[PDB]
Amino acid sequence: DTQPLITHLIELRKRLLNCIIAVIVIFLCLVYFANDIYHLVSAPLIKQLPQGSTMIATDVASPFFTPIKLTFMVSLILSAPVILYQVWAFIAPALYKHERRLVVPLLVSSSLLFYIGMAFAYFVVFPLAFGFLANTAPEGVQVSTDIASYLSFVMALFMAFGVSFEVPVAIVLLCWMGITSPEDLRKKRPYVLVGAFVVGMLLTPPDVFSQTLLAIPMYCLFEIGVFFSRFY
Template structure:
């Protein structure tokens, strides 16, 4: 479709609905594939802190439902992150018909490089920043203070760091 072509608003809304449904299906399929491994995924994300905690210290759950909902929440966030290429493609497929040819050529390298840098930033946070930050934070506790991190608070903190470095 050329830029000069116009379509009624309802056509655009139907196309947008289709693209949003494709994104939701992608996230849900990945989530359903990963939900069985929810506790394993949480242990993988918690490993940098657990390695730095003092001997005998453990993570705690201060809410009754935290042990159940926190791994599921993390699995959903991982599903969103893993489905990012599909979501970006759906955004691209919705917007591309309205762009000029020279604009379309610029988008593909931009999307590929930004996706790659996003995942590299997350890996950098996990393998470099987390061990350093958690080593510092757990070993600076005053004497007599037991380090026991809440699993829900830890997830919120980790996701904030992931987004800061991604």
């Protein structure tokens, strides 16, 4: 069913507005608690900071705009079900019946696993990592964590865990529908390892640290996904 370009842009504008309205309304209901929301996010770090160590703000606008930046992305995460539905409704006529049987399970399962990524990272990984990182400084070095740097690190881990949690289930689903077999995944192992570094390079700043902090979660959790593909 061919349609004029404006028809697709009319629909896209309507769906984009519903995404912006959802984010703004959630942001307005949450912007008043920006400092309280930052206390929750920085709670794992504060509990593990050494005696005499406290968080600092090295930027003039950081004390205000870093909590504001945090509650904005919290709004984006909380509005993901609305955003994903608008994405689904825009791409629903494009998908065929056979492609509909795969995208719908992916969209629903991604949302839950992406939240379990934060729950696992916040309640398990953050206490373990912060208790080690904050107490491994060289002698004479005072751990004074910048609030702007901490927010970037936390969202880097939250995005990494949420995305990488979906990889094993996506692999198992692809094995279930028959798109890919465990045998074919084992012979594509060298390419995924190189491909993981390529994906990490593109989606991260040119620092190698950000490349490896992302690529290793994909390739490792790719390997676990192949393991459960046997039990299916």
